[PDB]
Amino acid sequence: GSHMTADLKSLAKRIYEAYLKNFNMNKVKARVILSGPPFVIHDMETLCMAEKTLVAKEAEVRIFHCCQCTSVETVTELTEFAKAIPGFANLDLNDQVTLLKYGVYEAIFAMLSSVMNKDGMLVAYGNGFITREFLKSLRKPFCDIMEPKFDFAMKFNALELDDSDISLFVAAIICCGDRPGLLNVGHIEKMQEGIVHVLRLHLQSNHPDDIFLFPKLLQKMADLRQLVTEHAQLVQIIKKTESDAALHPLLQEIYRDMY
């Protein structure tokens, strides 16, 4: 003879659940694997072996093609994650497109930290480990794609975030009123403020030993925006000057007129 309401679960928990539902790889899963058996790619021969029995031109071009495939899978994961962020799918279609366009690579290099240590990174759905040195050994311009992402990750990983923290950080990256060309900038600023408020509160509960963790993560978001600007520059050079380095259409769309 009344009407009681749903609940609801805390927004931080719902974003964390959306992140576990939508991403194949997470920091718990990657750390399990990285501790201990992924096949190590550390030279040309181990690369040909991993390729033969795992992924069915010139070596640098195949590593870059594998880089893109990973990005496309993750872009698709990020799009589904975005749709689970309350308010996101009620935005104009154009604004959703714009938020993802500018945000996916910031989110990709943020989450990439979870599968990287100082020696290398997990690849191929956790089944390979490619060493940082091997990546440095490739010929230009391919020898410098990954190293800046490793440098960001070593310092990001030192913050000791867990998946509950990263899901909100990623959500704040996506729900960003800073992006060029937004029309309903007011609605998106309110959505972002709500996400960032829950992030700030979550970091206080989850990391009470580190009272500057929230300003540290704000800086990391600005570091990520710069990292992506430089990445896209590097990607343009590769496309321009390597005829085998064709770009997947979804990724071209994203880079097209980005920075």
Partner: peptide, 14 residues
């Protein structure tokens, strides 16, 4: 129009 400049991303979001 973002949506038309991003047809595959657009498709992912429908």
């Amino acid at each position: 129009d973002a949506a038309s400049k991003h047809k595959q991303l657009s498709e992912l979001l429908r």
